[PDB]
Amino acid sequence: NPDDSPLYVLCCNDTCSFTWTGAEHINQDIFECRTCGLLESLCCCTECARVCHKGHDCKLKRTSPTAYCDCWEKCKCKTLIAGQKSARLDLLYRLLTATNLVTLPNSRGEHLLLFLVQTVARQTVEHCQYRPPMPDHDLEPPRFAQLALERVLQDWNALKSMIMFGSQENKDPLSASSRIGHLLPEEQVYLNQQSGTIRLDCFTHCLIVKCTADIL
């Protein structure tokens, strides 16, 4: 499965938001699990929806009030413990220059660069309301996605696959033009004339407009 790739899983292993926010009521993105019972007032942070709840019926609620990740109350949250940072960066360094896992999108059709820049744009808004001094809640907010973006952008495979996305030799599983082999030959010609630039435009917009805290 595309969500079980070691590079994607290595990128989305971040510290859970209860570890840097206690019983406070900061503004986050709130997910709901039908399977685990987080239904009415029990909520979970975004890293919970990534690492937790991977095969569940987890969705995003639009009418989101403030919450504080009631994920450890109903299930065993796998994101309360952060590993060694230097070994994580060394593993990312070794996986970038030895495999070809960066050109494969996830189950939502997103490249690794788009996922990383969306994580950075979300965490810049979410992490500015951190006040320095049942699980432990005395750790810093996670800073890994900035360094991951800075390393992945220094590579002529990830930038090439991101910019040349939606072309002929690049298949997106959530696009209507990917599976056109059972149609009439004229419709195949009309669908193969064009190329896709939705995700590239989204990546450029998230890099320029939504990232107004860095230039690097």
Partner 1 sequence: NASSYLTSASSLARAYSIVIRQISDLMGLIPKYNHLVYSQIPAAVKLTYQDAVNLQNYVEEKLIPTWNWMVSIMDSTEAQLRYGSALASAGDPGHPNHPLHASQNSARRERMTAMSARGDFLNYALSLMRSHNDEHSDVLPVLDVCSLKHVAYVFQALIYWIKAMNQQTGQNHPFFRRSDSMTFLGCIPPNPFEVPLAEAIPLADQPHLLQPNARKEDLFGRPSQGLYSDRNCLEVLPTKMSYAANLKNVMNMQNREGPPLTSFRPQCSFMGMVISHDMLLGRWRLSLELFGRVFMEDVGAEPGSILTELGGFEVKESKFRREMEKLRNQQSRDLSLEVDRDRDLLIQQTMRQLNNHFGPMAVHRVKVTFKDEPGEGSGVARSFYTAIAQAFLSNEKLPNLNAPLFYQPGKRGFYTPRPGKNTEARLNCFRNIGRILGLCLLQNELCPITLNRHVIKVLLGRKVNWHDFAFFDPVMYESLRQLILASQSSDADAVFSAMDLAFAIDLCKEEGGGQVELIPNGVNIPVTPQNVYEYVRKYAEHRMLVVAEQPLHAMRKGLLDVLPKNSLEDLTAEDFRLLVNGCGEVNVQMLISFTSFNDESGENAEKLLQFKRWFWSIVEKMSMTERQDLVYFWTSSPSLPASEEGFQPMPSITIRPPDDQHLPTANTCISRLYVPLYSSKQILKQKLLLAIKT
- By CB under 8 A, what part of segment 154-183 binds partner 1? 166, 175-177, 179-180, 183
Choosing among partner 1, Zn ion, none, which partner's interface includes residue 24 (Cβ < 5 to 8 Å by kind)? none
For 77-108, give one letter per residue: b (16+ CB within 10 A) or e.
bebbebeeeeebeeebeeebeeeeebbebbee
Q: How far is the CB of 138 from Zn ion (least distance, A)?
A: 16
Choosing among Zn ion, partner 1, none, which partner's interface includes residue 191 (Cβ < 5 to 8 Å by kind)? partner 1
Is 137 annotated to bind a ligand? Reply is no
Q: How far is the CB of 177 from partner 1 (least distance, A)?
A: 5
Q: Please state the φ and ψ torsions of residue 118, each to the nearest 5 degrees.
A: -70, -35
Choosing among Zn ion, partner 1, none, which partner's interface includes residue 206 (Cβ < 5 to 8 Å by kind)? none
Packed helices 112-126 and 198-208: angle between N→C axes, nearest 10 degrees: 30
Q: How far is the CB of 173 from partner 1 (least distance, A)?
A: 13
Collapse the DSSP code of 33 into the 3-class scheme (helix H, G, I; strand E, B; otherwise coil) and give the result.
strand
The token pair that represents 74 in the structure block: 């109903």
**Residue 3 parent element (H or E):** none
47, 12 Cβ separation under 8 angstroms: yes
In eight-state DSSP terms, residue 7 is H
Q: How far is the CB of 172 from partner 1 (least distance, A)?
A: 9
Among 25, 81, 197, 213, binds partner 1 (CB under 8 A): 197
Which residues would be at the binding site for Zn ion (CB under 5 A)?
Answer: 16, 33, 35-36, 45, 48, 52-53, 56, 69, 71, 77
In the chain, which residues are last before a break of more than 2.5 Å from C to the next N? 133
Is 58 annotated to bind a ligand? Reply is no
Cross-strand bridge partners of residue 60: 31
Q: How far is the CB of 180 from partner 1 (least distance, A)?
A: 6
First to last CA, the chain: 33
Choosing among partner 1, Zn ion, none, which partner's interface includes residue 48 (Cβ < 5 to 8 Å by kind)? Zn ion
List contacts with partner 1 (CB under 8 A): 166, 175-177, 179-180, 183-184, 186-187, 189-191, 193-198
